């Protein structure tokens, strides 16, 4: 609806388009921040339960 | 007057290769890989 | 030997690329101490419906620091689906800890 | 008794109505009811020559113990969902019936079985009329003195192992009854084609999500519609068979359908894919288009593996799904 | 009674035979009755005169 309202705005001034990355949001490879933290926290999990 | 076909679609007759179709193919291929990988993580299909 | 335990790892929820690297470090940390690492494949539903437990070793962990999604499977199913069955399996595999 | 009038009315010989009088199970006796009725069928109808011949003309195959021999006790007794896709045009109605009971007895040797579901489909007009004869036969065979009906499944115990069975008989009389909400006036035409699509209409509206693990195939009358290969092809498309479903094809006569059939079942994936494609190209007309065969076309990617073959009788099992 | 006991001619795992149920094609089936309803109320009985 937001995209539809933008389109009709300015008596058809600009071309509005929707984009839905969606399930691609998970990514192909984890970032370095993710890799570094996954390691810190996994270590802390094991230290706790064990 | 010379035309060098340039479309991600490859709808122009005269060529079997339009400029930008490999760029496009590769970006969509990278997108589909991530989607299939996600399907592989969960008995699920994706309509792309 | 007396202090060695059976550790369970489960992936509950939608996929993230961070799952395999986290599971890798947790498996190595645990194996280093002599504990046995068991991966509950395909969340609680996998456990309940198929008893989908897989033992992990130093070699199994290979290439996981780079890989996205889940190698064991991730889903939003809950133990609620059948506690009794979850409890039966926890007792069978004698889990002494869970991540 | 009412059946005896129905039979005379359907041009059927009195023999049948006469059998239903001399037909009675001893119950208390060591011999299981299915086996009693079975032996009574052989006597009244003299099915000794024809059975022997059915073996003889099929390279002396054991037409009495087709299942029993091939499979071990576990394998035969694990089968729970069975579809019998008609009656052979090569055997008499009493031999065909007998064989139903005989195949049934074969899967019920054990006392360590989960329930059995057996579906008999009597597709053409030739056999269709004997539904009630078969129903009174299966009723006595199982001994449904547990708790017959105009419609519906016959439930009881069966064989050497008293294995709970539920025998389902799909024919046009039951299909008409259904369509007219059980009205007295069920006298209207119904083509074998219509009948196949209504059987499906029922599977999808009844909800059934159980897989057939033994598929009995033969040469039925009305091959234009009741074509062996075409029935298999359909079941493959609708995802109705178990991933290790057994496909038994029995008969005496060898024709082109049997060649077409065997070349498909035993064909390489490339052969099957073309088999399908060229049929569609050669046989599909804009008038033909709607027929079920044009929709539920088979799947080349289903692999089979030969298990048994004694001249004209064979067992193939689904061995994989390429994807 | 064998009727109330797990059936031996079935593709059953040791845990499936202990749980007395198995998941067939999604459907939770009783490893005894073959029925969808896993719990039979007739199995817990008072034996009297």
Swiss-Prot record, chain B:
Disulfide bonds: none annotated. Belongs to the phosphofructokinase type A (PFKA) family. ATP-dependent PFK group I subfamily. Eukaryotic two domain clade 'E' sub-subfamily. This is ATP-dependent 6-phosphofructokinase subunit beta. Beta-D-fructose 2,6-bisphosphate 1 binds at residue 44. It is found in: Cytoplasm. Catalyzes the phosphorylation of D-fructose 6-phosphate to fructose 1,6-bisphosphate by ATP, the first committing step of glycolysis. Heterododecamer of 4 alpha, 4 beta and 4 gamma chains. Beta-D-fructose 2,6-bisphosphate 2 binds at residues 7-11.
Swiss-Prot record, chain D:
Keywords: Cytoplasm, Glycolysis. One of its GO terms (cellular component) is cytoplasm. InterPro entries: PpPFK_gamma, PpPFK_gamma_sf. Pathway: Carbohydrate degradation; glycolysis; D-glyceraldehyde 3-phosphate and glycerone phosphate from D-glucose: step 3/4. The keyword Acyltransferase does not apply. It holds the Pfam family PpPFK_gamma-like_C. It is found in: Cytoplasm. GO terms for biological process: glycolytic process. Its main location: cytoplasm. Structural subunit of pyrophosphate--fructose 6-phosphate 1-phosphotransferase. Not required for catalytic activity. Fine-tunes allosteric regulation of the ATP-PFK by ATP, fructose 2,6-bisphosphate and AMP. Heterododecamer of 4 alpha, 4 beta and 4 gamma chains. The gamma chain bridges the N-terminal halves of the alpha and beta subunits. This subunit is only found in some Pichia species. This is ATP-dependent 6-phosphofructokinase subunit gamma. It comes from Komagataella pastoris.
UniProtKB/Swiss-Prot annotation, chain E:
It is found in: Cytoplasm. It comes from the Eukaryota. Catalyzes the phosphorylation of D-fructose 6-phosphate to fructose 1,6-bisphosphate by ATP, the first committing step of glycolysis. Heterododecamer of 4 alpha, 4 beta and 4 gamma chains. Belongs to the phosphofructokinase type A (PFKA) family. ATP-dependent PFK group I subfamily. Eukaryotic two domain clade 'E' sub-subfamily. This is ATP-dependent 6-phosphofructokinase subunit alpha. The chain holds residues 892 to 940 of 989 of the full protein.
């Amino acid at each position: 609806l937001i995209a539809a309202i933008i389109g009709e705005a300015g008596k058809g001034r600009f071309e509005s388009r929707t984009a839905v990355p969606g399930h691609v949001q998970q990514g192909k490879s984890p970032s370095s921040i993710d890799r570094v933290n996954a390691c810190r926290l996994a270590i802390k999990c094991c230290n706790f339960i064990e | 007057l010379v035309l060098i076909p340039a479309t991600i679609s490859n709808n122009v007759p005269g060529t079997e290769y339009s400029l930008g179709s490999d760029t496009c193919l590769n970006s969509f291929m990278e997108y589909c890989d991530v989607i299939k990988q996600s399907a592989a993580a969960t008995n699920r299909v994706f309509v792309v | 030997e007396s202090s060695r335990l059976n550790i369970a790892i489960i992936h509950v929820g939608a996929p993230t690329s961070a799952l395999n690297p986290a599971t890798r470090v947790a498996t190595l940390n645990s194996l280093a101490k002599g504990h046995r690492v068991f991966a509950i494949r395909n969340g609680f539903a996998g456990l309940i419906r198929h008893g989908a437990v897989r033992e992990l070793n130093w070699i199994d962990v290979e290439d996981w620091h780079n890989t996205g999604g889940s190698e064991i499977g991730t889903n939003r199913s809950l133990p609620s689906d059948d506690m009794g069955t979850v409890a039966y399996y926890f007792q069978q595999y004698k889990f002494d800890g869970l991540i | 008794d009412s059946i005896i009038r129905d039979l005379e009315r359907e041009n059927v010989g009195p023999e049948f109505g006469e059998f239903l009088n001399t037909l009675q199970t001893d119950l208390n006796s060591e011999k299981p009811p299915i086996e009693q009725v079975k032996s009574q069928l052989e006597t009244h109808f003299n099915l000794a020559h024809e059975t022997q011949e059915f073996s003889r003309k099929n390279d002396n195959a054991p037409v009495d113990k087709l299942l029993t021999n091939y499979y071990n006790n576990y394998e035969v007794n694990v089968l729970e969902f069975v579809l019998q896709m008609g009656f052979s045009r090569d055997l008499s109605i009493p031999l065909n019936v007998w064989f139903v009971l005989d195949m049934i007895s074969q899967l019920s040797t054990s006392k360590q079985d989960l329930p059995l579901d057996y579906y008999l489909v009597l597709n053409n007009s030739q056999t269709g009329k004997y539904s009630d004869f078969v129903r009174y036969l299966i009723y006595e065979a199982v001994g449904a003195e547990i708790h017959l009906a105009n419609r519906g499944p016959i439930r009881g115990n069966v064989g050497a192992g008293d294995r709970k069975i539920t025998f389902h008989l799909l024919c046009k009389k039951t299909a008409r009854m259904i369509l007219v909400g059980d009205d007295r006036e069920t006298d209207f035409e119904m083509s074998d084609r219509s009948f196949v699509t209504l059987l499906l209409d029922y599977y999808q509206r009844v909800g059934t999500t159980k897989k057939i693990d033994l598929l009995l195939l033969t040469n039925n009358f009305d091959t234009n519609m009741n074509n062996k290969l075409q029935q298999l092809k359909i079941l493959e498309s609708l995802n109705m068979l178990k991933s290790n479903c057994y496909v038994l094809d029995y008969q005496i006569t060898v024709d082109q359908v049997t060649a077409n059939f065997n070349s498909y079942v035993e064909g390489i994936p490339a052969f099957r894919r073309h088999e399908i494609a060229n049929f569609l190209k050669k046989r599909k007309t804009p008038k033909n288009a709607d027929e079920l065969i044009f929709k539920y076309v088979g799947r080349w990617n289903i692999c089979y593996q030969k298990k048994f073959h004694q001249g004209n009788i064979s067992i193939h099992q689904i061995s994989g799904y390429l994807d | 009674d064998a009727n109330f006991q797990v059936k031996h001619n079935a593709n059953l795992s040791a845990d499936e035979r202990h749980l007395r149920f198995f998941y067939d094609d999604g459907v939770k089936t009783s490893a005894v009755s073959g029925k969808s309803s896993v719990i039979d109320d007739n199995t817990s009985v008072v034996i009297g005169i």
